[PDB]
Design a protein around this motif. Structure first.
Motif, PDB file in Angstrom:
ATOM      1  N   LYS A  11      36.504  20.751  46.282  1.00  0.00           N
ATOM      2  CA  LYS A  11      37.553  21.621  46.825  1.00  0.00           C
ATOM      3  C   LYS A  11      37.372  21.875  48.318  1.00  0.00           C
ATOM      4  O   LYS A  11      38.322  21.759  49.079  1.00  0.00           O
ATOM      5  N   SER A  68      36.868  30.968  42.177  1.00  0.00           N
ATOM      6  CA  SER A  68      38.190  30.479  42.590  1.00  0.00           C
ATOM      7  C   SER A  68      38.252  30.303  44.096  1.00  0.00           C
ATOM      8  O   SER A  68      37.470  30.905  44.852  1.00  0.00           O
ATOM      9  N   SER A  70      41.196  30.583  46.961  1.00  0.00           N
ATOM     10  CA  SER A  70      42.490  30.857  47.566  1.00  0.00           C
ATOM     11  C   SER A  70      42.405  30.552  49.064  1.00  0.00           C
ATOM     12  O   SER A  70      41.417  29.987  49.546  1.00  0.00           O
ATOM     13  N   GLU A  71      43.459  30.902  49.786  1.00  0.00           N
ATOM     14  CA  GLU A  71      43.466  30.859  51.244  1.00  0.00           C
ATOM     15  C   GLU A  71      42.511  31.878  51.856  1.00  0.00           C
ATOM     16  O   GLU A  71      42.024  31.666  52.965  1.00  0.00           O
ATOM     17  N   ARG A  72      42.263  32.988  51.151  1.00  0.00           N
ATOM     18  CA  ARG A  72      41.260  33.992  51.584  1.00  0.00           C
ATOM     19  C   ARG A  72      39.819  33.458  51.553  1.00  0.00           C
ATOM     20  O   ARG A  72      38.943  33.988  52.252  1.00  0.00           O
TER      21      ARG A  72
END
Ligand SMILES: Cc1c(C(=O)C(N)=O)c2c(OCC(=O)O)cccc2n1Cc1cccc(Br)c1
Ligand SMILES: [Ca+2]
Length: 123
Positions: A11, A68, A70-72
């Motif tokens: 990722k 996970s 995210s964009e954060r």
């Protein structure tokens, strides 16, 4: 148990985790001598991270965690403190790999361990 880490690496880097296996002198089991480049330092730091976790009573080679992306950024989770710690060690490594994508060199993948020389830098 390398599944979750390998996933986190893919990722963050856009490369198979296999590209960071036997990379340089530190990525992959064990490690010694002087790190060949910045990516390899990530792995030296990651080895150090795992050492601290073992001294804490955790088993970071085996802990199963949740995460996970995210964009954060990368969110780490797990039932136990040890699981969350393992994720944190891995996260910092995955981010370090991404960040040094610029100097990743294919010549250091599958590095003959005989080519590792120098002292071993401490944690
Ligand atoms: C990047 C890395 C590792 C490291 O972070 C490191 N510091 O040596 C690593 C690794 O290090 C853990 C250790 O030596 O305690 C063992 C096996 C594969 C490893 N890999 C490659 C890897 C990582 C996850 C899934 C696959 Br498939 C392959
Ligand atoms: Ca290693």
């Amino acid at each position: 148990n390398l599944v979750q880490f390998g996933v986190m690496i893919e990722k963050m880097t856009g490369k198979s985790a296999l590209q960071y296996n036997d990379y340089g002198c530190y990525c992959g089991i064990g490690g010694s001598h002087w790190p060949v480049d910045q990516t390899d330092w990530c792995c030296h730091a990651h080895d150090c991270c795992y050492g601290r976790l073992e001294k804490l009573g955790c088993e970071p080679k085996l802990e199963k965690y949740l995460f996970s992306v995210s964009e954060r950024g990368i969110f780490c989770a797990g039932r136990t403190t040890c699981q969350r710690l393992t994720c944190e060690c891995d996260k910092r490594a995955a981010l370090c790999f991404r960040r040094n994508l610029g100097t990743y060199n294919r010549k250091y993948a599958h590095y003959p361990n005989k080519l590792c020389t120098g002292p071993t830098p401490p944690c």
